[PDB]
Amino acid sequence: GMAGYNLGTEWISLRSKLEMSDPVMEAYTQAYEASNQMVQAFGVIKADGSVLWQSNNWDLSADAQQLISAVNNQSASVKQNDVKYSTIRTSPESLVARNVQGNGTLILARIEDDKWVVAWASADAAPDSVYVDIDRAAKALKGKI
Prior knowledge:
Layout: H1 27-32, E1 40-46, H2 64-72, E2 78-79, E3 84-90, E4 95-98, E5 105-109, E6 115-121, H3 127-134
Antiparallel strand pairs: 1-6, 2-3, 3-4, 5-6
């Protein structure tokens, strides 16, 4: 062996992607930066039934318990802040929610086992346009939720 130690001390170069104390509330800008045309909310959901987010756009804490139930049992049907969004595709990886008309675009993302990040793109926002941004604020901060 006789290997050589590398960075890691107050560098965050080897993001373990779990149990890593990362700066929360940063994902907002991480995606908003490129989504300047279509701002999307970012609300974290913990399998524990609690939510740790600060978007003030959609009541995710109101029913954090149910917010996860929509996927916990592939329900696909939840209303947050007078906004009903169902997913016509319950997969073991994620669930794509879409409104019949187009009011409330929520995208589910399983960053980890009991950890998954979800964002809400405006009606004007596209699926492939937000689905790409959410990834930056999903499987990038996984660990501090």
